[PDB]
């Protein structure tokens, strides 16, 4: 019927509505490290969110986005294997039911347990839904979560999921500043790709960053909480959102870093 993550529903089945699944350009991928070429060409990413507005976070039944005014050049994202400014639309999630599951990319076969996707669209194309459409409409930035330490910037986060527990729940999400989610390094490998949900378009370049965040298992343990049903719906807990990786085919892994 209409996709999900259940066994009905779930990844295996989404070509038979979405034929791009089984694409040229599909994501995510495992990272190999060791065929991962380092291009000394690929200049630092420059990341400008000193300017970013939240807006609101919203639970739209398959993870939960927090949406940015991107009317303006105000949290924008430049330099790397990008040509143009691209600007930040929305941030969302994948996770798991347990910490040894849940990011959609893998390193070396090894999964974390979440991954966080900051979106950012080419203003070159004017708008979003144009941008979806073009070969180098979409930069993503990739950053995996291991279980640790609590990270300080994302309780505010935390903290609001009680307010959108079910789908098309939202909350008033306005002053998040997402610098508190960047790992310290911004050393990361990069490919071309697609979406890792349905719609599936491949319009993305990737940016995976080498270095995980820390977040507490407290935290995760909120997300974990999340219900891809509708309120007054029987319970279903928003687990395990990923999509498995996907064949690599003809495309090159770059490196910024060695
Ligand atoms: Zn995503």
Avoid at 36 to 43: T, V
Avoid at 186 to 206: A, K, R
Wanted: glycine share 8%; charged share 25%; with cysteine.
């Amino acid at each position: 019927h209409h996709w999900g993550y259940g066994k009905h529903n779930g990844p295996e089945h989404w070509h038979k509505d979405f034929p791009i699944a089984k694409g040229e350009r599909q994501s995510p991928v495992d990272i190999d490290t060791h065929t991962a070429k380092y291009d000394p060409s690929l200049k630092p990413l420059s990341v400008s969110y000193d300017q970013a507005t939240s807006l609101r976070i919203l639970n739209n039944g398959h993870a939960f986005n927090v949406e940015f005014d991107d009317s303006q050049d105000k949290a924008v994202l430049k330099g790397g294997p990008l040509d143009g400014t691209y600007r930040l639309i929305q941030f969302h999630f994948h996770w798991g039911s347990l910490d040894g599951q849940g990011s959609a990319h893998t390193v070396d076969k090894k999964k974390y347990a979440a991954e966080l996707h900051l979106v950012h669209w080419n203003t070159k194309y004017g708008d979003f839904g144009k941008a979806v459409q073009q070969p180098d409409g979409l930069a993503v930035l990739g950053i995996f979560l291991k279980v640790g330490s609590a990270k300080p910037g994302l309780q505010k986060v935390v903290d609001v999921l009680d307010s959108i527990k079910t789908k098309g729940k939202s909350a008033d999400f306005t002053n998040f500043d997402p610098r508190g989610l960047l790992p310290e390094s911004l050393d990361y490998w990069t490919y071309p790709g697609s979406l890792t949900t349905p719609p599936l378009l491949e319009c993305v370049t990737w940016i995976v960053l080498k270095e995980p965040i820390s977040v507490s298992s407290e935290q995760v343990l909120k997300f974990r909480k999340l219900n891809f049903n509708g309120e007054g719906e029987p319970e279903e807990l928003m687990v395990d959102n990923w999509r498995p990786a996907q064949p690599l085919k003809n495309r090159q892994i770059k490196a910024s870093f060695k």
